[PDB]
Design a protein around this ligand. Sequence first.
Ligand SMILES: *[C@@H]1O[C@H](CO)[C@@H](O[C@@H]2O[C@H](CO)[C@@H](O[C@H]3O[C@H](CO)[C@@H](O)[C@H](O)[C@@H]3O)[C@H](O)[C@H]2NC(C)=O)[C@H](O)[C@H]1NC(C)=O
Ligand SMILES: *[C@@H]1O[C@H](CO[C@@H]2O[C@@H](C)[C@@H](O)[C@@H](O)[C@@H]2O)[C@@H](O[C@@H]2O[C@H](CO)[C@@H](O)[C@H](O)[C@H]2NC(C)=O)[C@H](O)[C@H]1NC(C)=O
Ligand SMILES: *[C@@H]1O[C@H](CO)[C@@H](O[C@@H]2O[C@H](CO)[C@@H](O)[C@H](O)[C@H]2NC(C)=O)[C@H](O)[C@H]1NC(C)=O
Ligand SMILES: *[C@@H]1O[C@H](CO)[C@@H](O[C@@H]2O[C@H](CO)[C@@H](O)[C@H](O)[C@H]2NC(C)=O)[C@H](O)[C@H]1NC(C)=O
Ligand SMILES: *[C@@H]1O[C@H](CO)[C@@H](O[C@@H]2O[C@H](CO)[C@@H](O)[C@H](O)[C@H]2NC(C)=O)[C@H](O)[C@H]1NC(C)=O
Ligand SMILES: *[C@@H]1O[C@H](CO)[C@@H](O[C@@H]2O[C@H](CO)[C@@H](O)[C@H](O)[C@H]2NC(C)=O)[C@H](O)[C@H]1NC(C)=O
Ligand SMILES: *[C@@H]1O[C@H](CO)[C@@H](O[C@@H]2O[C@H](CO)[C@@H](O)[C@H](O)[C@H]2NC(C)=O)[C@H](O)[C@H]1NC(C)=O
Ligand SMILES: *[C@@H]1O[C@H](CO)[C@@H](O)[C@H](O)[C@H]1NC(C)=O
Ligand SMILES: *[C@@H]1O[C@H](CO)[C@@H](O)[C@H](O)[C@H]1NC(C)=O
Ligand SMILES: *[C@@H]1O[C@H](CO)[C@@H](O)[C@H](O)[C@H]1NC(C)=O
Ligand SMILES: *[C@@H]1O[C@H](CO)[C@@H](O)[C@H](O)[C@H]1NC(C)=O
Lengths: 240, 340, 46, 40
Amino acid sequence: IANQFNSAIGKIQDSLSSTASALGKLQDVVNQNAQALNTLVKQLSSNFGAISSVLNDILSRLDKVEAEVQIDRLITGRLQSLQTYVTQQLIRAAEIRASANLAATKMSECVLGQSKRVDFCGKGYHLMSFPQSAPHGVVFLHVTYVPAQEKNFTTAPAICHDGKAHFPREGVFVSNGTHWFVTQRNFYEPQIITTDNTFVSGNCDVVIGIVNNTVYDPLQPELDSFKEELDKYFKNHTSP
Amino acid sequence: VSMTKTSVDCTMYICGDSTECSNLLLQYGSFCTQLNRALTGIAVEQDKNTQEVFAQVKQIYKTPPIKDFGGFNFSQILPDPSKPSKRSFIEDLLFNKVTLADAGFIKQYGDCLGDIAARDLICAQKFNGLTVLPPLLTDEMIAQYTSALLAGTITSGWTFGAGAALQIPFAMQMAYRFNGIGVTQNVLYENQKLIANQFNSAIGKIQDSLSSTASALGKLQDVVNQNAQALNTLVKQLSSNFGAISSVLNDILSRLDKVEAEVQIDRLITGRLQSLQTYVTQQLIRAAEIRASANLAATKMSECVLGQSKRVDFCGKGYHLMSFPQSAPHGVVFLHVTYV
Amino acid sequence: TDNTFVSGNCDVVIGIVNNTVYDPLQPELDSFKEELDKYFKNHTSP
Amino acid sequence: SQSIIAYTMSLGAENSVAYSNNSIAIPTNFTISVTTEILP
Ligand SMILES: *[C@@H]1O[C@H](CO)[C@@H](O[C@@H]2O[C@H](CO)[C@@H](O[C@H]3O[C@H](CO)[C@@H](O)[C@H](O)[C@@H]3O)[C@H](O)[C@H]2NC(C)=O)[C@H](O)[C@H]1NC(C)=O
Ligand SMILES: *[C@@H]1O[C@H](CO[C@@H]2O[C@@H](C)[C@@H](O)[C@@H](O)[C@@H]2O)[C@@H](O[C@@H]2O[C@H](CO)[C@@H](O)[C@H](O)[C@H]2NC(C)=O)[C@H](O)[C@H]1NC(C)=O
Ligand SMILES: *[C@@H]1O[C@H](CO)[C@@H](O[C@@H]2O[C@H](CO)[C@@H](O)[C@H](O)[C@H]2NC(C)=O)[C@H](O)[C@H]1NC(C)=O
Ligand SMILES: *[C@@H]1O[C@H](CO)[C@@H](O[C@@H]2O[C@H](CO)[C@@H](O)[C@H](O)[C@H]2NC(C)=O)[C@H](O)[C@H]1NC(C)=O
Ligand SMILES: *[C@@H]1O[C@H](CO)[C@@H](O[C@@H]2O[C@H](CO)[C@@H](O)[C@H](O)[C@H]2NC(C)=O)[C@H](O)[C@H]1NC(C)=O
Ligand SMILES: *[C@@H]1O[C@H](CO)[C@@H](O[C@@H]2O[C@H](CO)[C@@H](O)[C@H](O)[C@H]2NC(C)=O)[C@H](O)[C@H]1NC(C)=O
Ligand SMILES: *[C@@H]1O[C@H](CO)[C@@H](O[C@@H]2O[C@H](CO)[C@@H](O)[C@H](O)[C@H]2NC(C)=O)[C@H](O)[C@H]1NC(C)=O
Ligand SMILES: *[C@@H]1O[C@H](CO)[C@@H](O)[C@H](O)[C@H]1NC(C)=O
Ligand SMILES: *[C@@H]1O[C@H](CO)[C@@H](O)[C@H](O)[C@H]1NC(C)=O
Ligand SMILES: *[C@@H]1O[C@H](CO)[C@@H](O)[C@H](O)[C@H]1NC(C)=O
Ligand SMILES: *[C@@H]1O[C@H](CO)[C@@H](O)[C@H](O)[C@H]1NC(C)=O
């Protein structure tokens, strides 16, 4: 498990070292804010129906009564340019606030905790996450347990042993083909079916698809060995 | 989950077929590019939203042909192979309760001119540069992702989200789902006929409700109605004077010379340009509402469908067992199964 | 004794009531006391 | 010999799940994976 985490962090270095487009979510946010300032600067070059885009070239050629008919066009067009930019930025800022509030929720729930929320902290069963800073953003390194080498088993909802029906306490029943076992749901570690692994409810007849097996009572040979302790004490005391 | 992808030919909206007006419009500079870039940013993300919601498996799970699911009868929500689009029965109800306008899918004038030019608002939108693009995924591709998610859920439980799909019997999955809600797993196995009959009856009430009421998909028809009303408002703004002697660009250029027309046409450019700016501002604000709905729907897909949710009243009111996705026009529908 | 866990005594728990927690090992040993006793009663014979 | 091609996009690898009313698959082993997620 340590070797797999150490190897998987080594792939984070190799990936970030290799590919150009991975941090595209952050670079796209730089490129929008830079393109919007560059579009706002290019819009100063527009005439808006005045004799020039250059404000001082109007004032170098026209007197007050002819100039204000030109300057007002440039005011009207350039104030429309700023209102457009500030509208685009006010809309944009809500995309980044919704992403900051998600990154703050991933910090609280993936870094300061462990998340039972499926696929919130990467595709797998979440173990933990580590924050890493990035320009105008955050990177989360989500660590997940992923189940890998699955083999098919025969299974049953319940076991019959004593007219009673038995169910897993935690886990599921499985057969290899000849013997029945109980195991944890997310990793094959098979165990003998016992009265400690299983709880009882009702008789066989009500459960659909139930099967016959023998449920070990680990108290029984611990008392039956005590019967051989009893019975040898009985045979010896026949002698005197 | 998404909305119609508009793109607007800003020079043909403001200056339909005119050189004089196009040469005046250039004096506002970047605006027509800034509008088309902004609308392209909205159109590009409708496919992001639809991909984030539905494309949560990179593997198209197929159901077994035999339906040994222990009494639970998914035939009502699984694909119907008989249909020309392989959508399920409940999806074929959802696809009829929302009435789309222009899915982008090809015009050949024979239908846009003559008998079909008249009443049809969509030809009036198009003839003034307002164009609607198709989604990236067709309604058949969305049904194949929804089919994979459902065929995964019933055969594999939550395991197809966390890793490779692991089969488990459906009545054995429901025992895990009962332990999830703190109920003991025998409370399924000792009542499985009742739990299957209650599920089958509850899906019977979904079919009946969607077949009976005229208003259930109101959250989706109100998106189609907002897009269609916004394009119709944008079309009507072409009929206004803005203080020019006429609304009609050719009625200025066939009546006034190369210097009287400049004073009139610049009014129509000012008011038409503000009409496009107002439209794209509304559509950018709107697109943030649909985004927020799509990011919620991708979360309900991740946590209710690919999982089981211990989050109270997130996946319908009750103790959550499981959910089935169904697609709809510009949206998604979750059938949330709950123990009450 | 399998359904429940023990912690401390009656004086601290506000509203605790009297009952008798079954020990499922106990009658399984009391029936072993009768398995023991019948062998002693037989062993009075030889 | 390179050219632009056009095609109906594949949605993913097709997989019929090996379901039966008594067959379960259980993982005999696991992979620990680390995945980077980037947020503005
Ligand atoms: C299903 O799992 C069973 C448990 O692993 C397995 O049975 C076990 O088989 C091994 C041999 O592979 C036996 O090992 C013993 O064999 C004899 C017993 O007299 C001894 O000489 C050996 O030293 C060794 O101790 C186990 O005794 C046996 N366990 C049980 C409970 O019988 C099955 O073979 C597996 N079946 C399939 C279909 O794979
Ligand atoms: C897991 O099992 C399924 C089928 O269950 C088994 O199928 C038999 C071959 C046999 O082992 C029985 O005891 C079980 O009931 C496998 O599905 C098969 O996949 C192959 C290709 O690999 C395909 O040709 C077969 O048609 C499939 N059989 C069925 C019934 O669907 C599946 O591949 C197994 N998975 C692994 C990892 O072994
Ligand atoms: C599980 O075991 C029980 C008991 O051994 C089986 O039930 C018996 O079935 C036979 C054949 O019909 C009858 O003659 C017995 O009287 C039955 N006894 C009981 C307690 O039911 C049952 O058939 C077995 N089930 C399986 C799947 O093997
Ligand atoms: C699952 O439910 C469907 C109905 O929702 C059942 O399909 C119907 O079956 C009857 C009897 O064969 C036919 O007369 C109907 O026309 C079928 N309806 C449809 C829409 O196909 C189906 O049989 C049920 N499955 C099980 C296992 O009971
Ligand atoms: C594109 O135009 C062609 C006509 O050139 C259309 O083909 C016609 O389709 C109808 C309906 O199937 C037939 O009745 C005609 O005889 C076809 N004519 C020809 C020449 O093929 C075709 O349907 C159009 N495609 C689209 C998407 O509009
Ligand atoms: C629960 O049982 C205990 C023990 O039987 C009770 O405590 C006894 O109370 C009586 C009356 O006050 C005393 O005379 C005894 O000496 C107490 N026994 C002990 C061991 O302290 C207790 O009152 C009972 N509680 C209830 C609610 O019935
Ligand atoms: C579980 O899977 C791991 C791989 O993730 C297995 O580890 C490899 O074991 C083989 C020998 O069987 C070595 O050649 C590899 O170099 C090992 N890899 C690592 C990362 O150490 C592991 O043996 C498997 N365990 C079981 C019980 O199947
Ligand atoms: C399981 O399905 C088989 C057919 O594949 C059938 O013979 C058997 O009775 C079913 N058993 C249960 C418990 O559903
Ligand atoms: C039999 O009991 C006597 C005590 O009376 C003891 O000393 C002796 O070791 C016992 N022998 C056996 C074989 O149990
Ligand atoms: C509960 O309330 C009753 C009055 O209704 C009171 O007599 C009793 O002592 C209370 N018991 C506890 C455990 O609070
Ligand atoms: C007593 O033990 C003998 C064997 O020594 C046995 O035959 C007999 O049935 C037993 N009787 C009782 C009452 O235990």
